Amino acid sequence: VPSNTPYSGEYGFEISFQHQSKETKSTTWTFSESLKKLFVRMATTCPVRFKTVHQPPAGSVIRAMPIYVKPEHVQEVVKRCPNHATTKEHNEDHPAPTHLVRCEHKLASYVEDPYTGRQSVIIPQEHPQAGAEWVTNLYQFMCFSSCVGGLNRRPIQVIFTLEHEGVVLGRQAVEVRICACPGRDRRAEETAA
Ligand SMILES: [Zn+2]
Known part of the structure; x- marks a missing residue:
């Protein structure tokens, strides 16, 4: 059971999303602060910002792992559907075509826990x-x-x-x-709440 409990920790680890102004905003993603929820198109690059208040130990890494939100689904590993995992589009020479979450970092490493089957992607933490x-x-x-x-x-x-x-x-x-x-899904979900 992977924890989702936010935890800044001793090094003050935080994430954020950059301001989007109407003039130059990308339509491919938008972040609802009130819902704490990212809306994004499939297979589009989405910018996520990271910081630490204090420099962590040399060689620290950042892992990104998707998990289901609701109790009815928490235990099931999040991964791509067989359709998208086995097509050739998006997948030419990718090392881990079944992973849902990808990262563009040059040193991104795609890992799977051999027992739980959990998939995630790790990259170095950087100053x-x-x-x-x-x-x-x-x-x-x-x-x-x-x-x-x-x-x-x-x-x-x-x-x-x-x-x-x-x-x-x-x-x-x-x-x-x-x-x-x-943008449409954000507005509608923010309206319903
Ligand atoms: Zn799919």
Whole structure:
């Protein structure tokens, strides 16, 4: 049972999403702060920002792992539907075509726990650039939330953990809905709530 409990930890690990102004905003993603929920199109690069208030130990990493939100689904591993996992589109030379969550980082490593089957992607933790508070990493989500035989309309979260040599040092999480029209789904979900 992977924990989703937010945890800044001793190093002050935090995530965020950059401001979107109407003039240059991407239509491929949008983040509802009131819902703590990312809306994003399938197979589009989505910017996620990370920081630590204090420098963590050398060689620390950041893991991204999707999990289902509701008790009725928590124990089931989140991964792509067989349809998308076995097609050739999106998958030419990918090392882990069944993983839902991908990261563009050059050193991204795709791992699967041999016992639980949990899939995640790990990248190095990095010092921000000069004068910058945040490091931006690019993720993609490789099925729609409605993929029959995959997510099948069940809600998911993505867990971000800062880790060093296996030990979780910090944790943040957001809900994620992968949909054709992030702005439309955000407005409608924010309206219903
Ligand atoms: Zn799919």
